[PDB]
Amino acid sequence: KKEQKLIQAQNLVREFEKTHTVSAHRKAQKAVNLVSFEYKVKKMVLQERIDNVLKQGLVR
Amino acid sequence: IKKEQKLIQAQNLVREFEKTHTVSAHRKAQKAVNLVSFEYKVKKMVLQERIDNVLKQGLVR
């Protein structure tokens, strides 16, 4: 399901915002990449959320 | 030797990461550091700290 992929991406982006880990970054970006391009705006916001955590700083 | 080349590569890549702060540079640097031999433990500790310090400042894509 395409909706399932979107939900997984939402959850993993949330986790990345909580922890800022390198591992969480990769899981979140992977999940976002796997969402269908048809969810244009939803994906853009998820991507921007990832980008914002990246610039805040990361930990291993 | 191979180990000596791996050390210099890690040093170069950490320096590049300090300059650019990119996700790509982070990965290249961390992989290279991980490949450094335990005989260079202190240099590895220093390189790892340098990576950690860039990471906490924030990265660009």
PDB file of C-alpha atoms in Angstrom:
ATOM      1  CA  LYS A   1       0.000   0.000   0.000  1.00  0.00           C
ATOM      2  CA  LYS A   2       1.074   3.558  -0.838  1.00  0.00           C
ATOM      3  CA  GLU A   3      -0.729   4.855   2.267  1.00  0.00           C
ATOM      4  CA  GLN A   4       1.277   2.386   4.391  1.00  0.00           C
ATOM      5  CA  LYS A   5       4.554   3.809   3.038  1.00  0.00           C
ATOM      6  CA  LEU A   6       3.397   7.345   3.900  1.00  0.00           C
ATOM      7  CA  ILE A   7       2.501   6.283   7.464  1.00  0.00           C
ATOM      8  CA  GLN A   8       5.880   4.551   7.946  1.00  0.00           C
ATOM      9  CA  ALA A   9       7.660   7.688   6.704  1.00  0.00           C
ATOM     10  CA  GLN A  10       5.650   9.882   9.080  1.00  0.00           C
ATOM     11  CA  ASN A  11       6.592   7.671  12.029  1.00  0.00           C
ATOM     12  CA  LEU A  12      10.277   7.503  11.124  1.00  0.00           C
ATOM     13  CA  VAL A  13      10.557  11.265  10.560  1.00  0.00           C
ATOM     14  CA  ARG A  14       9.002  11.742  14.027  1.00  0.00           C
ATOM     15  CA  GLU A  15      11.613   9.396  15.524  1.00  0.00           C
ATOM     16  CA  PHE A  16      14.400  11.326  13.790  1.00  0.00           C
ATOM     17  CA  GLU A  17      13.100  14.616  15.236  1.00  0.00           C
ATOM     18  CA  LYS A  18      13.190  13.008  18.700  1.00  0.00           C
ATOM     19  CA  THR A  19      16.670  11.494  18.567  1.00  0.00           C
ATOM     20  CA  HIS A  20      18.713  13.264  15.847  1.00  0.00           C
ATOM     21  CA  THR A  21      20.733  10.060  15.318  1.00  0.00           C
ATOM     22  CA  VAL A  22      22.610   9.166  12.149  1.00  0.00           C
ATOM     23  CA  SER A  23      20.701   5.847  12.079  1.00  0.00           C
ATOM     24  CA  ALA A  24      17.342   7.613  12.451  1.00  0.00           C
ATOM     25  CA  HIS A  25      18.267  10.051   9.670  1.00  0.00           C
ATOM     26  CA  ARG A  26      18.889   7.172   7.279  1.00  0.00           C
ATOM     27  CA  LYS A  27      15.736   5.270   8.200  1.00  0.00           C
ATOM     28  CA  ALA A  28      13.658   8.445   7.798  1.00  0.00           C
ATOM     29  CA  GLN A  29      15.191   9.408   4.450  1.00  0.00           C
ATOM     30  CA  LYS A  30      14.820   5.824   3.167  1.00  0.00           C
ATOM     31  CA  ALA A  31      11.134   5.802   4.141  1.00  0.00           C
ATOM     32  CA  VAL A  32      10.542   9.224   2.529  1.00  0.00           C
ATOM     33  CA  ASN A  33      12.264   8.070  -0.684  1.00  0.00           C
ATOM     34  CA  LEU A  34       9.934   5.035  -0.800  1.00  0.00           C
ATOM     35  CA  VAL A  35       6.755   7.107  -0.727  1.00  0.00           C
ATOM     36  CA  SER A  36       5.083   7.559  -4.105  1.00  0.00           C
ATOM     37  CA  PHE A  37       5.851  10.907  -5.775  1.00  0.00           C
ATOM     38  CA  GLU A  38       2.065  11.327  -6.130  1.00  0.00           C
ATOM     39  CA  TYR A  39       1.919  12.515  -2.502  1.00  0.00           C
ATOM     40  CA  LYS A  40       3.728  15.699  -3.557  1.00  0.00           C
ATOM     41  CA  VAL A  41       3.015  18.160  -0.721  1.00  0.00           C
ATOM     42  CA  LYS A  42       3.046  15.560   2.085  1.00  0.00           C
ATOM     43  CA  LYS A  43       6.450  14.377   0.875  1.00  0.00           C
ATOM     44  CA  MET A  44       7.788  17.953   0.635  1.00  0.00           C
ATOM     45  CA  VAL A  45       6.894  18.620   4.266  1.00  0.00           C
ATOM     46  CA  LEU A  46       8.416  15.301   5.423  1.00  0.00           C
ATOM     47  CA  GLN A  47      11.562  16.142   3.476  1.00  0.00           C
ATOM     48  CA  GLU A  48      11.699  19.617   4.983  1.00  0.00           C
ATOM     49  CA  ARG A  49      11.316  18.142   8.466  1.00  0.00           C
ATOM     50  CA  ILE A  50      14.323  15.889   7.763  1.00  0.00           C
ATOM     51  CA  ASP A  51      16.325  18.842   6.407  1.00  0.00           C
ATOM     52  CA  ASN A  52      15.584  20.895   9.524  1.00  0.00           C
ATOM     53  CA  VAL A  53      16.834  18.160  11.881  1.00  0.00           C
ATOM     54  CA  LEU A  54      19.995  17.796   9.781  1.00  0.00           C
ATOM     55  CA  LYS A  55      20.881  21.464  10.189  1.00  0.00           C
ATOM     56  CA  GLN A  56      20.100  21.368  13.942  1.00  0.00           C
ATOM     57  CA  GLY A  57      22.811  18.735  14.410  1.00  0.00           C
ATOM     58  CA  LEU A  58      23.226  14.973  14.713  1.00  0.00           C
ATOM     59  CA  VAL A  59      24.659  12.396  17.062  1.00  0.00           C
ATOM     60  CA  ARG A  60      25.847   8.834  16.431  1.00  0.00           C
TER      61      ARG A  60
ATOM     62  CA  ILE B   1      51.548   0.041   3.481  1.00  0.00           C
ATOM     63  CA  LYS B   2      47.802  -0.464   2.950  1.00  0.00           C
ATOM     64  CA  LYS B   3      47.219   0.563   6.580  1.00  0.00           C
ATOM     65  CA  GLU B   4      49.301   3.726   6.117  1.00  0.00           C
ATOM     66  CA  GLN B   5      47.251   4.675   3.057  1.00  0.00           C
ATOM     67  CA  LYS B   6      44.010   4.062   4.955  1.00  0.00           C
ATOM     68  CA  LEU B   7      45.138   6.387   7.751  1.00  0.00           C
ATOM     69  CA  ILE B   8      46.035   9.229   5.375  1.00  0.00           C
ATOM     70  CA  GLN B   9      42.749   8.770   3.498  1.00  0.00           C
ATOM     71  CA  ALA B  10      40.830   9.070   6.765  1.00  0.00           C
ATOM     72  CA  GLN B  11      42.795  12.204   7.694  1.00  0.00           C
ATOM     73  CA  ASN B  12      42.093  13.773   4.295  1.00  0.00           C
ATOM     74  CA  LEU B  13      38.405  12.891   4.385  1.00  0.00           C
ATOM     75  CA  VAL B  14      37.883  14.220   7.899  1.00  0.00           C
ATOM     76  CA  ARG B  15      39.505  17.509   6.831  1.00  0.00           C
ATOM     77  CA  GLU B  16      37.178  17.676   3.806  1.00  0.00           C
ATOM     78  CA  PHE B  17      34.170  17.002   6.053  1.00  0.00           C
ATOM     79  CA  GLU B  18      35.232  19.872   8.338  1.00  0.00           C
ATOM     80  CA  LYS B  19      35.293  22.128   5.259  1.00  0.00           C
ATOM     81  CA  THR B  20      31.954  21.146   3.694  1.00  0.00           C
ATOM     82  CA  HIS B  21      29.705  19.664   6.415  1.00  0.00           C
ATOM     83  CA  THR B  22      27.838  17.560   3.821  1.00  0.00           C
ATOM     84  CA  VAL B  23      26.058  14.236   4.308  1.00  0.00           C
ATOM     85  CA  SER B  24      28.308  12.777   1.578  1.00  0.00           C
ATOM     86  CA  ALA B  25      31.485  14.011   3.262  1.00  0.00           C
ATOM     87  CA  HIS B  26      30.261  12.684   6.612  1.00  0.00           C
ATOM     88  CA  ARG B  27      29.834   9.184   5.205  1.00  0.00           C
ATOM     89  CA  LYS B  28      33.153   9.139   3.393  1.00  0.00           C
ATOM     90  CA  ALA B  29      34.957  10.337   6.527  1.00  0.00           C
ATOM     91  CA  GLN B  30      33.258   7.932   8.931  1.00  0.00           C
ATOM     92  CA  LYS B  31      33.790   4.906   6.704  1.00  0.00           C
ATOM     93  CA  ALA B  32      37.447   5.827   6.261  1.00  0.00           C
ATOM     94  CA  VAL B  33      37.961   6.277  10.007  1.00  0.00           C
ATOM     95  CA  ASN B  34      36.344   2.878  10.655  1.00  0.00           C
ATOM     96  CA  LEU B  35      38.874   1.261   8.309  1.00  0.00           C
ATOM     97  CA  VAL B  36      41.880   2.667  10.213  1.00  0.00           C
ATOM     98  CA  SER B  37      43.926   0.090  12.110  1.00  0.00           C
ATOM     99  CA  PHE B  38      43.851  -0.115  15.908  1.00  0.00           C
ATOM    100  CA  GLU B  39      47.606   0.519  15.893  1.00  0.00           C
ATOM    101  CA  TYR B  40      46.620   4.155  15.198  1.00  0.00           C
ATOM    102  CA  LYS B  41      44.157   4.251  18.091  1.00  0.00           C
ATOM    103  CA  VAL B  42      44.869   7.792  19.283  1.00  0.00           C
ATOM    104  CA  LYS B  43      44.687   9.252  15.774  1.00  0.00           C
ATOM    105  CA  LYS B  44      41.418   7.379  15.345  1.00  0.00           C
ATOM    106  CA  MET B  45      40.111   8.897  18.594  1.00  0.00           C
ATOM    107  CA  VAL B  46      41.070  12.368  17.381  1.00  0.00           C
ATOM    108  CA  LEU B  47      39.515  11.837  13.939  1.00  0.00           C
ATOM    109  CA  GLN B  48      36.341  10.456  15.500  1.00  0.00           C
ATOM    110  CA  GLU B  49      36.045  13.465  17.811  1.00  0.00           C
ATOM    111  CA  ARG B  50      36.485  15.758  14.809  1.00  0.00           C
ATOM    112  CA  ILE B  51      33.659  13.942  13.005  1.00  0.00           C
ATOM    113  CA  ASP B  52      31.435  14.162  16.095  1.00  0.00           C
ATOM    114  CA  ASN B  53      32.098  17.896  16.394  1.00  0.00           C
ATOM    115  CA  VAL B  54      31.066  18.565  12.801  1.00  0.00           C
ATOM    116  CA  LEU B  55      27.979  16.369  13.172  1.00  0.00           C
ATOM    117  CA  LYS B  56      26.672  18.297  16.179  1.00  0.00           C
ATOM    118  CA  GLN B  57      27.015  21.622  14.290  1.00  0.00           C
ATOM    119  CA  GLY B  58      24.590  20.441  11.641  1.00  0.00           C
ATOM    120  CA  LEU B  59      24.873  19.070   8.135  1.00  0.00           C
ATOM    121  CA  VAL B  60      23.926  20.182   4.667  1.00  0.00           C
ATOM    122  CA  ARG B  61      22.585  17.858   1.962  1.00  0.00           C
TER     123      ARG B  61
END
